[PDB]
């Protein structure tokens, strides 16, 4: 069974459900956003599942796949591992890290992540 909340923003509402894992997502929280007036007719998989489906049906290993990418991206070598990781992770809502938020003690985070100053 699929989950009750959007994996990207943790809120309630209408979701597309992954067919190979329990995650659910708001149509607009996906990357790219899915149009509810043009929903996919067949199965649908989240980015994380899509990546594992990719890897498994690959002749090479995830270590080798990663290795060739880094070679392919030597012009931006310091970012190559960061770039490779993107496609294995589902989209999420941006949130400021705690080391920024904690600098401002008068500011609180509300129940949906919203800025609150009482």
């Amino acid at each position: 069974e699929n989950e009750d909340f959007c994996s990207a923003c943790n809120q309630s509402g209408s979701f597309l459900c992954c067919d190979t894992c329990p995650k659910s997502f708001h149509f607009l929280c996906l990357d790219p956003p899915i149009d509810p007036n043009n929903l996919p007719k067949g199965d649908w998989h989240c980015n994380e599942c899509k990546f594992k489906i990719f890897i498994n049906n690959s002749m090479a290993t995830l270590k080798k796949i990663e290795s060739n990418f880094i070679k392919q991206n030597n012009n931006v070598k310091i970012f190559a591992k960061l770039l490779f990781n993107i496609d294995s992770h589902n989209p999420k809502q941006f949130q400021l890290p705690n080391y920024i938020k904690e600098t401002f003690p008068a500011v609180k985070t509300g129940s949906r992540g919203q800025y609150s100053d009482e």
Binding site: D4, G13, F15, L16
Partner: peptide
């Protein structure tokens, strides 16, 4: 594809 409301 499957949808869900909650």
């Amino acid at each position: 594809a499957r949808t869900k409301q909650t």
